[PDB]
């Protein structure tokens, strides 16, 4: 009936562009740094020792595929708050939170915005940091919400502008809504040091706003859960009732299986069983009820004392492979005689790296070194491997020379 | 702090009330006519034998667990429109459709509705039959859509409007859009004829209505995936370009596993492509890409020849020992010397079965029987099983009589 003939064809993905040219190539020098997920060594997908056994372990059981709750799998939310919160936090202690299950950390960060926007009286204002990662836009903008933004990344020193946050911040209408990268700032790797985040947390309180606190890399960034998580806990301390999206994806590489979890702090255990009927309502016409294999398998992980065990190692060796990367990077630049400064490759944390290189120069490095990344100098760290990270120092110092 | 102070408690669900109750009830008879999934004649979740073979088969490759393209995927999706429409179907041949991978058939319906309040121009008002499934409601009022109703179920026989339905959908505004519940309606079981869907496909064309098919039931009513999918097709070929939603759910029996799709019928291959980036860009802010665990399954089953053989006959299996239980209901409930007609029970299709009987005698069944059902005198079949079908009939004499 012609109901579609007005539907326009969307714009194309720009990483999309990267992965296909990358793809096309026959040069076998070639590196792809537009990679989104974790990449061994071997330039190959990883799935954790631990997932295996956890995925055996349940075809072990014969267990049904019967529907979960609305809010998902019991076991896997509280495991899921505990891992977030603490084992000895207060907040968890009291029960004073609610955690339900969500579609990997994007639908957690979707049912979240919905909340918000049905809940949230005080304000429509969402203010990301500057730069956010992409989805975040459309994700609070569908949601019906309004997008502000703050100083973040500063492009002189491939660091925190932290005069530019603190100044953004300050002038924040009180109980505006402010979203907060837990660690790994996605795409800068930029993230706050302790005496920042101590800084940022006591303004935050001062001026009343709600800490939306999105945690994608636990234990991925520094291999420690604990110091990953250190922010978000303190902010927590300090009496601020933050909302929490976490994503399994990264830190159990459970990234198709979309094992995640959104959570709302509460006054007490009363008022948590309220907002938990209300996210209950929210979700049902969502989606019904949650995927059961990711929550499945990292229920098992983080309540099997054995797997839990053998999980910290394993999300450790992920964090020490990329960290021996941005370590390795800076040393060859140097063996390059490169005169310049790329200490901020190894003051970044996680995946993604804002290398400073120039549109012009990541042109030259596609074009004549068969690498490729995306115009803004990011740079995944996860394409780099001990083989080609001479060729990647090699090849930036030639365009920046 | 006291963000959430006044968020209140949510409408407590009644589904839920008659499990929980039925639970904590002693009665070793006692029935849960009440639960909204297939039970097997033992009263226990059956998970299917192609199913476990699937299972086994992609354990045995071990499979990466990398993010799905947004769409889903590819092998899924086909052999999904592939069911939905058929072979040989022209729409299916010449590539003018678009099917995206849904989190099940409720978040496929969501997906549709959203892409409906953002493209479908020509109206908000969205037509459901009276009555239609709970969640039908709150899935379109939040996507942003207008709810009206269109006569459907008969109470007076327990039957089909015919004549309150082509009278109220003859006088739809044209271009509003029509849902239509394919087969096995949920909750009443009454579904047209043949030749009541000719003259419904009719009215739909002359009336120039957006139709969207809700799928949920596809060879798990008659046992027969072609015939079940009869009137979708029919609409079809008849030049209704309608919208779709399928879940794997109940056919499958992958109910946690959320497996399901949204399609879109279009005039041409062209549109189609068109059509699918715009799906793209609205799914990506809601959950980024889908889980992948259901469509492997579901995958395997349809791509696979000797699953496929196996899960027909599996899924015969099911629909059989719903249409013996409906069978062996009315010929109990004859025999205890009851006057009332119950053929209705025959007449009506799938899981879900519109009893008639009136609240006070459902709380007498619950009260008397220990016979958990929900006030309006639905129940599910699958409750009911060949060693206490002649309990219920009992039961439902006395109450009648
Ligand atoms: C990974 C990521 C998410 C969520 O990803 P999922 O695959 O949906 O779990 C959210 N925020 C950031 C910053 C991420 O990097
Ligand atoms: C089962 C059902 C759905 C979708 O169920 P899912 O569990 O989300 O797949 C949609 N419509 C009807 C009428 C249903 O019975």
Redesign the interface.
Known sequence: ??????????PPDPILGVTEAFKRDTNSKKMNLGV??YRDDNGK?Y?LNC??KA??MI?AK?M?????PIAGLADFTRASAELALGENSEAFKSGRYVTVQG?????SL?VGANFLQR????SRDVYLPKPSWG?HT??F??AGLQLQAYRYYDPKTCSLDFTGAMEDISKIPEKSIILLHACAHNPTGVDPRQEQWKELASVVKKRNL?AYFDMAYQGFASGDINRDAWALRHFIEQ?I?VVLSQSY?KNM??????AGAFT?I??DAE?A???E??L???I???????????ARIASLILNTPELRKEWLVEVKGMADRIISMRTQLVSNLKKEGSSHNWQHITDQIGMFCFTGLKPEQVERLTKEFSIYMTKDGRISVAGVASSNVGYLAHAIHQVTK
């Not at 009936?1 to 969307?10: D, F, I, Y």
């Not at 579609?103 to 639908?107: A, K």
């Open positions: 009936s012609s109901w579609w003939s007005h539907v326009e064809m969307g989104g997920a997908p799935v997932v295996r995925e055996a075809a014969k049904d595929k019967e529907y979960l579609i990997s950390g994007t639908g979707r809940f949230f009286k005080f989805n459309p994700i903008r569908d709600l009496g009732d994806a590489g459970l990234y198709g299986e979309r709302v509460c006054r008022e069983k309220r907002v009927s209300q209950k309502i929210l049902r016409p969502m989606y019904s009820n949650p995927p059961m294999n990711g």
